[PDB]
Coordinates of C-alpha atoms in Angstrom, one line a residue:
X1 CA 0.3 0.0 -0.3
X2 CA 1.8 3.3 -0.9
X3 CA 2.1 6.6 2.0
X4 CA 3.3 9.6 1.0
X5 CA 6.7 9.6 0.8
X6 CA 9.1 12.3 -0.7
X7 CA 12.6 11.0 -1.0
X8 CA 11.5 8.5 -2.8
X9 CA 9.6 8.7 -7.2
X10 CA 6.4 10.3 -7.4
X11 CA 3.6 7.2 -8.6
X12 CA 3.0 7.4 -12.0
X13 CA -0.9 8.5 -11.7
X14 CA -1.5 10.7 -8.4
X15 CA -5.0 10.6 -9.3
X16 CA -5.4 8.0 -7.6
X17 CA -4.5 8.3 -4.6
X18 CA -6.2 8.8 -1.5
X19 CA -7.9 12.3 -0.6
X20 CA -5.9 14.5 0.6
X21 CA -2.9 12.8 0.5
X22 CA -1.1 16.1 -1.0
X23 CA -2.1 18.4 0.9
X24 CA 1.2 20.0 2.3
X25 CA 2.8 19.2 -0.4
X26 CA 2.9 22.2 -2.8
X27 CA 1.2 23.7 0.5
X28 CA 2.2 27.7 1.3
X29 CA 3.1 29.1 4.8
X30 CA 2.7 32.7 4.2
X31 CA 0.3 33.2 1.6
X32 CA -4.0 34.2 1.4
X33 CA -5.7 31.6 1.1
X34 CA -8.5 29.4 2.5
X35 CA -8.2 26.0 5.7
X36 CA -8.6 24.3 2.8
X37 CA -10.6 24.4 -0.4
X38 CA -10.7 26.4 -4.0
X39 CA -9.8 30.2 -3.4
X40 CA -11.2 32.5 -6.0
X41 CA -11.4 35.7 -7.1
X42 CA -10.6 38.2 -4.2
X43 CA -12.2 41.3 -3.5
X44 CA -14.8 42.7 -1.6
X45 CA -12.2 44.4 1.3
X46 CA -12.0 47.5 3.1
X47 CA -10.6 48.8 6.0
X48 CA -12.7 49.4 8.9
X49 CA -13.8 53.1 10.1
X50 CA -14.4 51.5 13.0
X51 CA -11.8 49.2 14.2
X52 CA -9.4 50.2 12.5
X53 CA -8.7 46.4 11.1
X54 CA -8.3 45.8 7.5
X55 CA -11.1 42.6 6.5
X56 CA -10.2 40.5 3.5
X57 CA -12.5 38.8 0.5
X58 CA -11.8 36.3 -1.9
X59 CA -15.0 34.1 -3.8
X60 CA -14.7 30.5 -2.3
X61 CA -15.4 26.6 -3.8
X62 CA -17.9 28.3 -6.1
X63 CA -19.5 29.0 -2.7
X64 CA -19.7 32.8 -2.6
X65 CA -17.1 34.8 -0.9
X66 CA -15.4 34.4 2.5
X67 CA -13.6 36.7 4.3
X68 CA -10.8 37.4 7.0
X69 CA -9.0 40.5 9.2
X70 CA -5.8 41.6 9.9
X71 CA -4.2 44.2 12.6
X72 CA -1.0 44.5 10.4
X73 CA -1.0 42.8 6.9
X74 CA 1.6 40.3 8.0
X75 CA -1.1 37.6 10.0
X76 CA -4.8 37.5 8.6
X77 CA -7.3 35.0 10.4
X78 CA -10.3 34.1 10.2
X79 CA -13.9 35.2 9.9
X80 CA -15.2 31.6 11.0
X81 CA -15.3 28.1 10.2
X82 CA -16.6 26.0 8.5
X83 CA -15.4 27.8 5.1
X84 CA -15.3 31.7 6.8
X85 CA -18.6 32.7 5.2
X86 CA -19.1 36.5 4.8
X87 CA -21.9 36.4 2.1
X88 CA -23.4 32.5 -0.1
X89 CA -26.1 33.0 -2.8
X90 CA -29.6 31.5 -2.5
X91 CA -31.5 34.8 -2.2
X92 CA -33.8 36.3 -3.9
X93 CA -31.7 38.1 -6.5
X94 CA -28.2 35.4 -6.1
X95 CA -30.7 32.9 -6.8
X96 CA -27.4 30.7 -8.4
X97 CA -24.6 32.3 -7.6
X98 CA -22.8 34.8 -5.7
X99 CA -20.0 37.4 -7.6
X100 CA -16.9 39.4 -7.1
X101 CA -18.7 42.9 -5.1
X102 CA -16.1 45.5 -3.0
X103 CA -17.2 47.5 -0.2
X104 CA -17.7 51.7 1.6
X105 CA -17.1 51.5 4.5
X106 CA -19.6 54.0 5.8
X107 CA -22.9 52.5 4.4
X108 CA -26.5 51.9 4.8
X109 CA -27.6 51.8 8.0
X110 CA -23.8 54.0 8.5
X111 CA -22.1 51.0 7.9
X112 CA -19.9 48.6 5.7
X113 CA -22.3 48.0 3.0
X114 CA -21.3 45.6 0.0
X115 CA -22.5 46.2 -3.6
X116 CA -21.6 42.5 -5.5
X117 CA -22.3 41.2 -8.0
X118 CA -26.2 39.1 -7.9
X119 CA -26.7 36.6 -10.5
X120 CA -29.7 34.7 -11.2
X121 CA -28.7 33.0 -14.8
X122 CA -26.3 30.6 -15.8
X123 CA -23.5 29.6 -18.5
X124 CA -22.1 33.4 -18.6
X125 CA -19.8 34.1 -21.2
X126 CA -18.8 36.1 -23.5
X127 CA -18.6 33.8 -26.4
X128 CA -21.7 33.1 -26.1
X129 CA -25.5 34.8 -25.4
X130 CA -25.8 36.6 -22.9
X131 CA -29.4 36.1 -21.0
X132 CA -31.3 38.8 -20.1
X133 CA -30.8 38.7 -15.4
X134 CA -28.0 36.4 -15.1
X135 CA -26.0 39.8 -13.8
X136 CA -27.4 42.7 -11.1
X137 CA -26.3 44.5 -8.3
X138 CA -27.4 44.2 -5.0
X139 CA -26.4 45.6 -1.4
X140 CA -25.6 43.5 1.4
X141 CA -24.6 45.0 5.5
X142 CA -22.0 44.1 7.6
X143 CA -23.6 42.6 10.2
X144 CA -20.9 41.7 13.6
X145 CA -18.0 42.9 12.7
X146 CA -18.0 42.5 9.6
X147 CA -17.8 38.1 9.9
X148 CA -21.6 38.2 7.6
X149 CA -22.5 39.8 5.0
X150 CA -26.7 40.7 5.6
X151 CA -28.7 40.2 2.2
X152 CA -30.5 44.1 2.1
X153 CA -34.6 43.1 1.0
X154 CA -35.2 44.4 -1.7
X155 CA -34.0 43.5 -5.6
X156 CA -30.9 44.9 -6.4
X157 CA -29.7 48.2 -7.1
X158 CA -28.3 48.5 -10.2
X159 CA -31.0 45.0 -11.9
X160 CA -30.0 45.6 -15.9
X161 CA -26.9 45.9 -18.2
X162 CA -27.5 49.6 -20.0
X163 CA -30.4 50.2 -21.5
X164 CA -30.9 47.3 -24.4
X165 CA -26.8 47.5 -25.1
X166 CA -26.0 43.7 -25.8
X167 CA -22.9 43.5 -23.2
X168 CA -20.5 40.7 -22.8
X169 CA -20.5 40.3 -18.9
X170 CA -21.8 43.2 -16.4
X171 CA -20.3 42.2 -13.6
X172 CA -17.4 42.4 -10.4
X173 CA -18.5 46.6 -9.8
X174 CA -15.7 48.0 -7.7
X175 CA -16.0 51.7 -5.5
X176 CA -13.9 54.2 -5.3
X177 CA -14.1 58.4 -4.7
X178 CA -12.7 60.7 -7.3
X179 CA -11.8 64.2 -7.5
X180 CA -11.8 65.1 -10.5
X181 CA -14.7 63.1 -12.0
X182 CA -16.7 65.0 -8.8
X183 CA -14.7 67.9 -10.6
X184 CA -15.6 66.8 -14.6
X185 CA -19.1 66.3 -13.7
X186 CA -19.9 69.6 -11.7
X187 CA -17.9 72.0 -14.0
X188 CA -19.6 73.4 -17.2
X189 CA -19.0 71.6 -20.5
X190 CA -16.9 73.8 -22.2
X191 CA -15.0 74.8 -18.8
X192 CA -14.1 71.3 -17.5
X193 CA -12.3 71.9 -21.4
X194 CA -9.3 73.8 -20.3
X195 CA -7.4 71.8 -17.2
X196 CA -7.0 75.3 -15.7
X197 CA -9.7 75.8 -14.3
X198 CA -10.6 71.7 -13.1
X199 CA -7.3 71.7 -11.0
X200 CA -8.7 74.4 -9.6
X201 CA -11.2 73.3 -8.4
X202 CA -10.2 70.2 -8.0
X203 CA -7.4 71.8 -4.8
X204 CA -10.0 72.4 -3.1
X205 CA -11.9 69.2 -3.2
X206 CA -13.2 67.8 -0.1
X207 CA -13.3 62.8 0.0
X208 CA -15.5 62.9 3.4
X209 CA -18.2 64.1 0.8
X210 CA -18.0 62.7 -1.9
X211 CA -19.9 60.8 -4.3
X212 CA -19.1 57.2 -4.7
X213 CA -18.4 56.1 -8.0
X214 CA -19.3 51.8 -9.0
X215 CA -17.2 50.5 -12.0
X216 CA -19.1 48.0 -14.1
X217 CA -16.6 45.0 -16.1
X218 CA -17.7 43.6 -19.3
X219 CA -18.2 44.4 -22.7
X220 CA -20.1 44.7 -25.7
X221 CA -20.8 42.1 -28.5
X222 CA -19.5 43.1 -31.8
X223 CA -17.6 45.9 -30.5
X224 CA -15.4 45.6 -27.4
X225 CA -14.6 45.1 -23.8
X226 CA -15.5 48.4 -21.8
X227 CA -16.1 49.4 -18.2
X228 CA -19.4 50.7 -17.4
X229 CA -18.9 54.0 -14.7
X230 CA -22.1 54.7 -12.9
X231 CA -22.4 57.3 -9.0
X232 CA -24.8 57.8 -6.4
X233 CA -27.5 59.7 -8.8
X234 CA -27.0 62.9 -8.7
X235 CA -23.4 62.8 -6.5
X236 CA -25.2 62.6 -3.7
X237 CA -22.8 61.0 -1.0
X238 CA -26.0 59.5 1.2
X239 CA -27.7 58.2 -2.3
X240 CA -27.1 54.3 -2.0
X241 CA -30.8 52.9 -3.4
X242 CA -30.3 54.9 -7.1
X243 CA -27.7 54.8 -9.5
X244 CA -26.7 56.9 -11.8
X245 CA -25.4 55.1 -15.5
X246 CA -22.7 57.6 -16.7
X247 CA -21.8 55.9 -19.5
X248 CA -18.9 53.2 -21.3
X249 CA -16.3 55.8 -19.4
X250 CA -13.7 52.8 -21.5
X251 CA -14.4 51.1 -24.0
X252 CA -11.6 49.3 -27.0
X253 CA -12.4 47.7 -30.1
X254 CA -12.7 43.2 -30.4
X255 CA -9.2 42.2 -29.3
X256 CA -7.4 45.7 -29.9
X257 CA -4.3 46.4 -28.1
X258 CA -1.8 48.7 -26.7
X259 CA 0.6 49.7 -28.5
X260 CA 1.1 48.0 -32.1
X261 CA 2.1 44.9 -31.9
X262 CA 0.6 43.7 -28.1
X263 CA 4.0 43.4 -27.2
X264 CA 4.3 45.3 -23.7
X265 CA 0.6 45.1 -22.7
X266 CA -0.7 42.4 -24.3
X267 CA -4.4 42.9 -25.9
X268 CA -7.5 43.7 -24.9
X269 CA -9.6 41.1 -25.7
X270 CA -13.7 40.6 -26.0
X271 CA -14.1 41.0 -22.0
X272 CA -12.9 43.6 -19.3
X273 CA -13.5 41.6 -15.7
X274 CA -12.6 42.7 -11.7
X275 CA -11.7 46.7 -12.7
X276 CA -10.4 48.5 -10.0
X277 CA -9.7 52.2 -10.2
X278 CA -6.9 53.3 -8.3
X279 CA -5.3 57.5 -8.2
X280 CA -1.8 57.4 -7.3
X281 CA 0.8 59.6 -6.3
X282 CA 5.2 58.6 -6.4
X283 CA 3.7 58.0 -2.2
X284 CA 1.0 55.5 -2.4
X285 CA -2.7 56.6 -3.0
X286 CA -4.8 59.5 -3.0
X287 CA -8.5 60.2 -5.0
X288 CA -8.0 64.6 -5.0
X289 CA -4.2 64.8 -6.5
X290 CA -2.7 60.4 -7.9
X291 CA -3.2 59.9 -10.7
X292 CA -6.1 57.3 -12.7
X293 CA -5.0 53.7 -12.9
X294 CA -6.2 51.3 -13.4
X295 CA -5.7 47.0 -12.8
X296 CA -8.2 44.5 -14.6
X297 CA -7.9 40.9 -16.5
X298 CA -8.9 41.0 -20.1
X299 CA -10.5 37.5 -21.0
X300 CA -8.3 36.8 -25.2
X301 CA -8.4 33.8 -27.3
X302 CA -6.5 33.0 -30.7
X303 CA -8.5 32.1 -33.9
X304 CA -10.6 30.0 -34.3
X305 CA -12.7 30.7 -30.9
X306 CA -13.7 27.8 -28.5
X307 CA -17.2 29.2 -27.6
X308 CA -17.1 29.5 -23.7
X309 CA -13.4 29.4 -23.8
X310 CA -11.0 31.1 -22.5
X311 CA -7.8 31.0 -23.9
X312 CA -5.0 33.9 -22.0
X313 CA -6.2 35.3 -18.4
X314 CA -4.2 38.6 -19.3
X315 CA -4.0 40.7 -15.9
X316 CA -3.1 44.2 -16.9
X317 CA -3.0 47.5 -15.9
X318 CA -3.4 51.0 -17.8
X319 CA -2.4 55.3 -15.9
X320 CA -3.5 57.9 -17.6
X321 CA -6.3 61.0 -17.7
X322 CA -9.8 61.2 -17.7
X323 CA -11.4 64.1 -19.7
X324 CA -15.5 64.6 -20.3
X325 CA -16.9 63.6 -22.8
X326 CA -16.0 65.7 -25.3
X327 CA -19.3 66.8 -27.7
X328 CA -21.5 63.6 -28.4
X329 CA -24.1 61.7 -26.2
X330 CA -21.9 59.3 -25.8
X331 CA -19.8 58.1 -21.5
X332 CA -20.0 61.7 -19.1
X333 CA -16.7 60.4 -18.7
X334 CA -13.8 59.2 -20.7
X335 CA -10.9 57.4 -19.5
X336 CA -8.0 57.4 -22.0
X337 CA -5.1 55.1 -21.5
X338 CA -1.1 56.8 -22.1
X339 CA 0.5 53.9 -20.8
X340 CA 0.3 50.2 -19.5
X341 CA 1.3 47.0 -18.3
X342 CA 0.9 44.0 -16.6
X343 CA 0.4 43.3 -12.9
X344 CA 1.8 40.2 -13.3
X345 CA 2.9 38.6 -16.4
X346 CA 1.7 35.1 -14.2
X347 CA 0.1 32.6 -16.8
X348 CA -2.1 32.2 -13.7
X349 CA -2.2 34.7 -12.3
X350 CA -5.3 37.0 -12.4
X351 CA -8.6 39.3 -10.9
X352 CA -6.5 41.4 -8.5
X353 CA -8.8 42.9 -6.3
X354 CA -7.2 46.2 -4.1
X355 CA -8.2 48.5 -1.6
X356 CA -6.9 51.8 -0.2
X357 CA -5.8 51.2 2.7
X358 CA -6.1 54.8 5.1
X359 CA -2.7 56.1 7.2
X360 CA -4.8 55.6 9.9
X361 CA -5.6 52.3 9.7
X362 CA -4.9 49.6 13.0
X363 CA -2.1 48.2 10.0
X364 CA -0.8 51.3 8.9
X365 CA -0.8 53.2 12.9
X366 CA 1.2 50.4 14.0
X367 CA 4.2 49.9 11.4
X368 CA 4.2 53.8 11.3
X369 CA 3.2 53.7 7.8
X370 CA 2.0 58.5 7.2
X371 CA 0.1 57.8 3.6
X372 CA -2.6 56.1 2.4
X373 CA -1.6 53.2 0.8
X374 CA -2.8 51.0 -2.2
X375 CA -2.8 47.2 -1.5
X376 CA -3.8 45.3 -4.6
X377 CA -4.5 41.4 -4.0
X378 CA -3.5 39.2 -6.8
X379 CA -5.0 35.6 -7.6
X380 CA -3.2 32.6 -8.6
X381 CA -5.5 30.4 -10.4
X382 CA -4.6 27.0 -8.6
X383 CA -5.8 24.9 -11.5
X384 CA -5.4 27.1 -14.9
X385 CA -8.6 28.5 -14.9
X386 CA -10.3 25.4 -14.7
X387 CA -8.6 23.9 -17.7
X388 CA -6.0 22.3 -16.0
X389 CA -5.6 18.6 -17.9
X390 CA -6.7 16.2 -14.6
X391 CA -5.1 18.1 -11.8
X392 CA -4.8 15.8 -9.3
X393 CA -6.9 18.3 -6.8
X394 CA -9.2 15.4 -4.6
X395 CA -5.7 14.7 -3.3
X396 CA -4.7 17.9 -2.6
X397 CA -7.8 18.7 -0.6
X398 CA -7.4 22.7 -2.0
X399 CA -6.8 25.1 -5.4
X400 CA -4.8 28.8 -5.6
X401 CA -4.0 31.3 -3.2
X402 CA -4.1 34.8 -3.4
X403 CA -0.1 36.3 -4.0
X404 CA 1.9 38.6 -2.0
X405 CA -0.5 41.6 -1.2
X406 CA 1.6 44.0 -3.0
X407 CA 2.2 48.0 -2.8
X408 CA 0.5 50.5 -6.0
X409 CA 2.2 53.7 -6.8
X410 CA 4.0 56.1 -9.1
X411 CA 6.8 54.6 -10.0
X412 CA 10.3 56.7 -11.2
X413 CA 13.2 55.9 -12.5
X414 CA 15.3 59.1 -12.7
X415 CA 19.0 59.1 -15.5
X416 CA 17.9 57.6 -18.2
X417 CA 19.8 58.2 -21.4
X418 CA 16.7 59.1 -24.3
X419 CA 16.8 57.0 -26.4
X420 CA 15.0 54.9 -29.1
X421 CA 14.2 52.3 -25.9
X422 CA 12.5 55.2 -24.2
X423 CA 10.8 56.1 -26.8
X424 CA 9.4 52.9 -28.3
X425 CA 5.3 53.5 -29.0
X426 CA 2.6 51.9 -27.3
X427 CA 5.6 51.4 -23.8
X428 CA 4.8 50.6 -20.0
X429 CA 5.9 53.9 -19.1
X430 CA 5.8 56.9 -20.2
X431 CA 8.3 60.1 -19.9
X432 CA 7.8 62.4 -17.1
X433 CA 10.7 65.2 -17.5
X434 CA 13.6 65.2 -21.0
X435 CA 16.5 67.1 -22.1
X436 CA 16.6 64.6 -25.4
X437 CA 19.9 64.0 -23.5
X438 CA 19.3 62.5 -20.1
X439 CA 14.7 61.3 -18.8
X440 CA 12.9 60.9 -15.6
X441 CA 10.8 58.0 -16.8
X442 CA 6.8 57.2 -15.3
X443 CA 5.4 53.6 -14.4
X444 CA 3.1 51.7 -12.4
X445 CA 5.3 50.9 -9.3
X446 CA 5.0 47.4 -7.7
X447 CA 7.1 46.1 -4.5
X448 CA 5.4 43.5 -1.9
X449 CA 4.0 45.1 1.0
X450 CA 6.2 46.9 3.5
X451 CA 5.0 45.1 6.3
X452 CA 4.9 41.6 4.8
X453 CA 7.5 41.6 3.1
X454 CA 9.5 42.9 7.0
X455 CA 7.4 39.5 8.3
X456 CA 9.0 37.6 5.7
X457 CA 12.2 38.2 6.2
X458 CA 11.8 38.5 10.3
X459 CA 13.4 35.3 11.5
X460 CA 14.9 33.9 8.9
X461 CA 18.5 32.5 8.4
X462 CA 20.4 35.1 6.5
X463 CA 23.2 33.7 4.3
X464 CA 24.9 35.8 1.9
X465 CA 26.7 34.5 -1.9
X466 CA 29.9 36.1 -2.8
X467 CA 29.6 38.3 -5.5
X468 CA 30.4 36.6 -8.3
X469 CA 31.3 36.8 -12.4
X470 CA 30.3 34.0 -15.5
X471 CA 31.8 35.1 -19.0
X472 CA 31.2 31.4 -20.4
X473 CA 28.7 28.8 -19.6
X474 CA 28.1 27.8 -16.0
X475 CA 26.4 26.4 -13.5
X476 CA 27.2 26.8 -10.1
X477 CA 26.2 26.0 -6.6
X478 CA 25.4 28.1 -4.1
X479 CA 28.2 28.0 -0.9
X480 CA 25.4 26.8 1.3
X481 CA 21.5 26.7 -0.3
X482 CA 19.0 25.6 2.0
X483 CA 17.4 22.2 3.1
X484 CA 13.6 24.0 2.8
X485 CA 11.6 24.8 0.0
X486 CA 10.4 28.9 1.8
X487 CA 13.3 31.0 1.1
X488 CA 13.7 34.7 -0.2
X489 CA 16.5 35.1 -3.6
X490 CA 18.0 38.4 -4.0
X491 CA 20.6 39.2 -6.5
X492 CA 21.7 42.3 -8.1
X493 CA 22.8 41.2 -11.4
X494 CA 24.8 44.2 -14.3
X495 CA 25.3 43.8 -18.2
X496 CA 27.5 44.9 -20.0
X497 CA 26.5 46.8 -23.2
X498 CA 27.4 44.5 -25.0
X499 CA 24.4 42.3 -24.0
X500 CA 21.3 43.5 -25.3
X501 CA 22.2 42.1 -28.9
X502 CA 24.1 38.8 -27.3
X503 CA 21.9 35.6 -26.9
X504 CA 22.7 36.1 -23.3
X505 CA 20.8 34.5 -20.4
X506 CA 21.7 35.1 -16.7
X507 CA 20.6 34.2 -13.8
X508 CA 19.6 31.1 -11.1
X509 CA 18.3 27.1 -10.1
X510 CA 15.6 26.9 -7.9
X511 CA 14.1 24.4 -6.1
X512 CA 17.4 22.2 -7.8
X513 CA 18.6 18.9 -6.9
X514 CA 19.6 15.9 -10.1
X515 CA 16.6 14.7 -11.4
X516 CA 14.4 18.2 -10.6
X517 CA 15.6 21.8 -11.3
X518 CA 13.6 25.4 -12.0
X519 CA 15.6 27.9 -14.7
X520 CA 14.4 32.4 -13.3
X521 CA 17.3 33.9 -15.9
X522 CA 17.3 37.4 -17.9
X523 CA 17.0 37.2 -21.6
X524 CA 17.7 40.3 -23.6
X525 CA 17.0 38.4 -27.0
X526 CA 12.9 39.6 -26.1
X527 CA 13.8 41.0 -22.8
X528 CA 12.3 38.8 -20.8
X529 CA 11.5 37.3 -17.4
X530 CA 11.9 34.2 -18.2
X531 CA 10.5 30.5 -14.9
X532 CA 11.9 27.7 -16.9
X533 CA 9.6 24.7 -16.1
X534 CA 10.0 22.0 -18.0
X535 CA 12.1 19.9 -15.2
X536 CA 10.3 21.2 -12.6
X537 CA 8.6 18.0 -11.5
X538 CA 9.3 15.3 -11.8
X539 CA 5.9 13.5 -11.8
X540 CA 5.1 16.4 -14.4
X541 CA 6.1 14.1 -17.3
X542 CA 3.7 11.6 -16.1
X543 CA 0.4 13.8 -14.6
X544 CA -0.3 16.6 -17.3
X545 CA -2.1 18.3 -14.9
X546 CA 0.7 19.7 -14.0
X547 CA 1.3 22.4 -16.1
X548 CA 5.2 22.5 -16.8
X549 CA 5.4 25.4 -20.0
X550 CA 7.7 28.7 -20.1
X551 CA 6.6 31.4 -17.8
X552 CA 8.2 35.2 -19.1
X553 CA 7.0 38.9 -19.0
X554 CA 8.9 41.5 -21.0
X555 CA 11.5 43.8 -18.9
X556 CA 14.0 46.9 -20.5
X557 CA 16.2 47.4 -18.4
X558 CA 16.9 50.8 -19.6
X559 CA 20.3 52.8 -20.5
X560 CA 21.4 54.5 -16.8
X561 CA 23.6 57.1 -16.0
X562 CA 24.3 56.0 -12.7
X563 CA 28.6 57.3 -11.3
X564 CA 28.5 59.8 -14.4
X565 CA 29.1 56.4 -16.3
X566 CA 26.5 54.8 -18.5
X567 CA 25.4 51.9 -17.9
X568 CA 22.7 49.0 -18.3
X569 CA 20.5 49.6 -15.4
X570 CA 20.6 46.6 -12.2
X571 CA 19.3 43.9 -12.3
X572 CA 17.6 44.0 -8.8
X573 CA 15.6 40.9 -8.2
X574 CA 13.5 39.7 -5.3
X575 CA 12.2 36.0 -5.5
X576 CA 10.2 34.8 -3.4
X577 CA 9.5 30.2 -2.6
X578 CA 6.4 29.9 -0.6
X579 CA 7.3 26.4 -0.9
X580 CA 5.0 26.0 -5.1
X581 CA 3.7 29.9 -4.7
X582 CA 7.3 31.2 -6.7
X583 CA 6.8 35.2 -6.8
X584 CA 9.6 37.4 -9.1
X585 CA 9.8 40.6 -8.6
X586 CA 12.4 42.8 -10.4
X587 CA 13.9 46.9 -9.7
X588 CA 10.3 47.2 -7.6
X589 CA 8.1 47.8 -11.2
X590 CA 7.4 43.9 -12.5
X591 CA 6.1 41.3 -11.7
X592 CA 5.5 37.6 -13.0
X593 CA 3.8 34.9 -10.5
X594 CA 3.4 30.9 -11.1
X595 CA 3.8 27.0 -9.4
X596 CA 7.0 25.2 -9.2
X597 CA 5.6 21.8 -7.7
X598 CA 8.4 20.2 -7.3
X599 CA 8.1 17.2 -6.0
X600 CA 11.6 16.0 -4.1
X601 CA 12.0 16.7 0.1
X602 CA 16.2 17.4 -1.7
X603 CA 15.1 20.1 -4.8
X604 CA 16.0 22.6 -2.6
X605 CA 19.7 23.9 -3.5
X606 CA 20.5 27.2 -5.5
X607 CA 22.5 27.7 -8.0
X608 CA 24.0 30.1 -10.4
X609 CA 23.1 30.1 -14.3
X610 CA 24.8 31.9 -17.3
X611 CA 24.7 30.4 -20.7
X612 CA 27.9 32.0 -22.1
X613 CA 26.6 34.3 -23.9
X614 CA 27.4 37.7 -23.3
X615 CA 28.6 38.4 -19.4
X616 CA 27.4 39.3 -17.2
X617 CA 28.3 40.1 -12.7
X618 CA 26.0 38.8 -9.5
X619 CA 26.2 41.1 -6.7
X620 CA 24.6 41.7 -3.2
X621 CA 23.5 37.8 -3.8
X622 CA 21.8 36.5 -0.6
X623 CA 19.4 33.6 0.4
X624 CA 16.5 34.1 4.2
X625 CA 15.5 30.6 4.7
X626 CA 12.0 29.9 6.5
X627 CA 9.2 32.7 6.1
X628 CA 6.9 33.1 8.8
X629 CA 2.7 31.6 9.7
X630 CA 0.7 33.6 8.1
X631 CA -2.0 32.2 10.0
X632 CA -0.9 31.7 13.1
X633 CA -4.6 30.6 15.1
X634 CA -5.2 27.8 12.2

């Protein structure tokens, strides 16, 4: 009889094993996921005014939204046992299912109010006809410290999609406040034109009494993906029953894409999902002075399209400006992208749900953060969006996880040589300023939420590696590698100008032993960070459910002036390995996450890697082992 032994070869068929046999094999310890079962889109996050506690939400087992709380954004506590659900389907407005939603901290009865998508019909997909009434938006109010959300005893507050518009989807409402939208909507049309009058109005705007806006995601059949915008009727902050439709504030033609060749920001695809609206500054979040950014998932597909199958799930972001709906009878305000990119380049990374985290929160007061931030939680589906080829789900006893909480802000890159690398059209950055010689770039900054990063390292064992240079091809083991699959790898790679045109590939191999290895390296040929998973798991060859295709993301290392000398920008890597959950971060503006399901206990070696093409200098390489327990009470 077989009893799990990960020092021995994996059985040929993992799906024949007893239930829960693989429960701990690839399970993380410092990530957000339910006690068991599967996790879907994260959503419904909010800072509770009264307690200052940050509440996290997420779809769980396709049967509603579950939650947890945190007082430090380092450890979490389930709202309750038996799934820890907050709201489930079975009501009059959501007889079939409960989809994504967002929370207004001070709403009905002056308590946390959830505005969510109540579902009454299935199936629902952009590639098939939409059934009228499938998705509506309903209200629920928090009870017992947010440990539960009671549905208001009435029908949906937005009971239908825009009149006569053939939507592909109409879900995932996201609430937010905005000085600029308030200004644009109040000012006379021809006045709301000149930026001068507008900005003056914004300066005196006050958040506390401003109305709530709602962005619902979807698209329109035969036209393309879009975001539907609404706001408390008449701009009345006390109006929660009626939401006036402001139009399709952002739409893109079917499967079009940012830039001419769909290079830096995938494609807009056929439908927009889980849209988030943010207002960022170079320090964090501010709805008065922050620039408009939007994160969203886009559903894509090759041709011929296979109905009810989205082959591509891109986790994108866009930054831009908002203006009045011009000279038309269309949207009252429109979002115009100026730059776009990926929040996470991972194939399985998607449906990010974030929220403002007030400096007044219990979390920020404890860590001493004096500014408001925007923390975003990205989803990492556990089974390729339910398209996996027989993953041993019953054996694992759980599916999926959220990625580490991430701080989003405006990140600047200074001292960049103003050349073609900077001027390419359709990129993920804008030129903040330049004298035709050097410039300052502006892009989306992505970092692990500081408290979480602090916790990941607090009690870790630190082991540094000697700076090293590699010219000839080589795979060099570290002096000492971790003995577990829980660690944080840090390193800086410096490349010579000559490496740009070379077939150079430089990085590290991790989770390695004789029969397994995972490679992570930078590649100039297509300026990408790559995670080669072709040899990650000894169990993959006979278990197709364990995807092993290559993951990768574009990362351009600009020419910069550092010490009076021009050099290729330094690749600053941070790789967090929480068992099978791998997250590759780079230069505070890049994230690529995936599943590295290695089998053997011994596959913990780490090695320097260089393909002999070009040259590379490794510096400040170090490993922190151990991470921490994100769920102390479980």
